[PDB]
Amino acid sequence: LYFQSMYQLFEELGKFSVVRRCVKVLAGQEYAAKIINTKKLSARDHQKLEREARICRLLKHPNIVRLHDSISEEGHHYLIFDLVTGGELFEDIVAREYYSEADASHCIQQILEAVLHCHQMGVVHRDLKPENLLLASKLKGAAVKLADFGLAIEVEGEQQAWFGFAGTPGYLSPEVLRKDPYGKPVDLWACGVILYILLVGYPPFWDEDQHRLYQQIKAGAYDFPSPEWDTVTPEAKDLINKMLTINPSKRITAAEALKHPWISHRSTVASCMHRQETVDCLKKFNARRKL
Numbered sequence: 001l002y003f004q005s006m007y008q009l010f011e012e013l014g015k016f017s018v019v020r021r022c023v024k025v026l027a028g029q030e031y032a033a034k035i036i037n038t039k040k041l042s043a044r045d046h047q048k049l050e051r052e053a054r055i056c057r058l059l060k061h062p063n064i065v066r067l068h069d070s071i072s073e074e075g076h077h078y079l080i081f082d083l084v085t086g087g088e089l090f091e092d093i094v095a096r097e098y099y100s101e102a103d104a105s106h107c108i109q110q111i112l113e114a115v116l117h118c119h120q121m122g123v124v125h126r127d128l129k130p131e132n133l134l135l136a137s138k139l140k141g142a143a144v145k146l147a148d149f150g151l152a153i154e155v156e157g158e159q160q161a162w163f164g165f166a167g168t169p170g171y172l173s174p175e176v177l178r179k180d181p182y183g184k185p186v187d188l189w190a191c192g193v194i195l196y197i198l199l200v201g202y203p204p205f206w207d208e209d210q211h212r213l214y215q216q217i218k219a220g221a222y223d224f225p226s227p228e229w230d231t232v233t234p235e236a237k238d239l240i241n242k243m244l245t246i247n248p249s250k251r252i253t254a255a256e257a258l259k260h261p262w263i264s265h266r267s268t269v270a271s272c273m274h275r276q277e278t279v280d281c282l283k284k285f286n287a288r289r290k291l
């Protein structure tokens with residue numbers, strides 16, 4: 001009755017939920033509505049929606065999409081955010097004529113600033129993956145924006161706890177797979193996975209057998225094969241090694257990654273060589289995520 005009174009829904013943008021473009025009619029302004037069907041939810045999932053709404057109002061950062069309204073109706077809940085109009089970063093990269101380590105580094109720098117902000121606010125995302133990395137607009141030099149904090153949790157300082165088995169198979173951290181207490185480091189692991197894909201166009205851990213995948217993640221069994229990693233700077237590999245560290249107490253933090261020479265000295269450390277095989281391989285990677 002009441003949401004349909006104020007917003008008009010148009011096309012679908014993505015999918016847990018669906019996200020549709022809406023217009024707030026009488027204000028003549030557009031947003032993205034994350035629309036959750038609340039029948040397909042337990043008592044605990046309803047309570048987690050109130051936490052999701054809470055978390056999203058806390059976060060004010062240029063690299064995080066902002067929440068504008070939270071409306072619950074008969075069967076549904078509506079979270080109304082800023083509309084960002086450039087689509088996935090990963091889909092944008094493949095349409096570019098030039099793509100280098102310097103571009104990867106600037107993307108990761110923006111992501112890490114988003115993640116530092118979350119961590120400073122006591123918020124751990126838990127599910128960072130390509131799907132959450134949107135572009136503010138179609139304009140050149142648009143900001144990378146984090147969208148969707150559906151699995152995000154609130155942490156108490158630097159305390160670790162067993163918050164549940166949650167996340168996406170290829171980006172899951174060893175500590176979560178071992179069923180160990182976890183916290184902020186889970187997000188840095190996921191960033192290492194994202195940085196690896198950004199450099200070569202394929203993921204560090206992959207197996208058609210999920211149980212084997214999990215054993216690979218838990219062992220830290222990734223490598224940098226020739227020929228394609230031969231033209232990657234040692235400092236990009238070094239950053240990846242420090243994010244994909246199996247022991248979360250030893251893993252690099254967001255604050256530390258932002259001071260890493262490949263990030264903070266991008267302009268004199270990151271390669272500017274076009275990586276055409278990354279572009280081509282990422283197109284294939286994207287196609288598999290959509291299939």
Ligand SMILES: O=C1Nc2ccccc2/C1=C1/Nc2ccccc2/C1=N\OCC[C@@H](O)CO
Pocket residue numbers: 013014015019032034065081082083084085086087088131132134147148
């Ligand atoms: O503008 C947007 N504000 C948001 C707030 C939360 C979640 C998604 C979006 C979003 C999106 N805007 C656009 C524009 C073009 C293509 C996709 C797309 C979006 N989201 O896509 C779905 C991804 C997300 O649901 C995965 O967790």
